Design a protein around this ligand. Structure first.
Ligand code: A1BF5
Ligand code: ZN
Length: 113
């Protein structure tokens, strides 16, 4: 099992849709989640978050064929949104952002596979 091209294209498309998504207001919800903060700017995050992941890492994993399925991919997206729900205050915009991105990923997953 190496990963067929179509799987890899699918994932990229899905994760591309999540990243480029904008709300009605025109805003791109993912922007903050693309890169993990520095251990200098936000050391508490890395005390508080067991397994840190950003959208850059997810793309690394797709490119390097490390997800064996769409469901392995999804498990890293939900970790991302979960890390974001853990660290950020409930009802904060980042917290709410992560929940919509969960949703956007699921929709993308059906419109694409
Ligand atoms: C909102 C917060 C804490 C954050 C702040 C900053 C900056 C802003 C400007 N001043 C310094 C810090 C950067 C990155 C992130 N970030 C955050 N929460 C996440 O959940 C998260 C995830 Br899953 C993946 C990647 C980054 C994340
Ligand atoms: Zn390859």
């Amino acid at each position: 099992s190496p990963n067929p091209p179509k799987l890899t294209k699918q994932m990229n498309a899905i994760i591309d849709t999540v990243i480029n998504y904008k709300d009605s207001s025109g805003r791109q919800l993912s922007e903050v989640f693309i890169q993990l903060p520095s251990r200098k700017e936000l050391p508490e995050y890395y005390e508080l978050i067991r397994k840190p992941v950003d959208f850059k890492k997810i793309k690394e994993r797709i490119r390097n064929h490390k997800y064996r399925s769409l469901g392995d991919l999804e498990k890293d997206v939900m970790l991302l949104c979960h890390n974001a729900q853990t660290f950020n205050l409930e009802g904060s915009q980042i917290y709410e952002d992560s929940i919509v991105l969960q949703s956007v990923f699921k929709s993308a997953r059906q419109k694409i596979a």
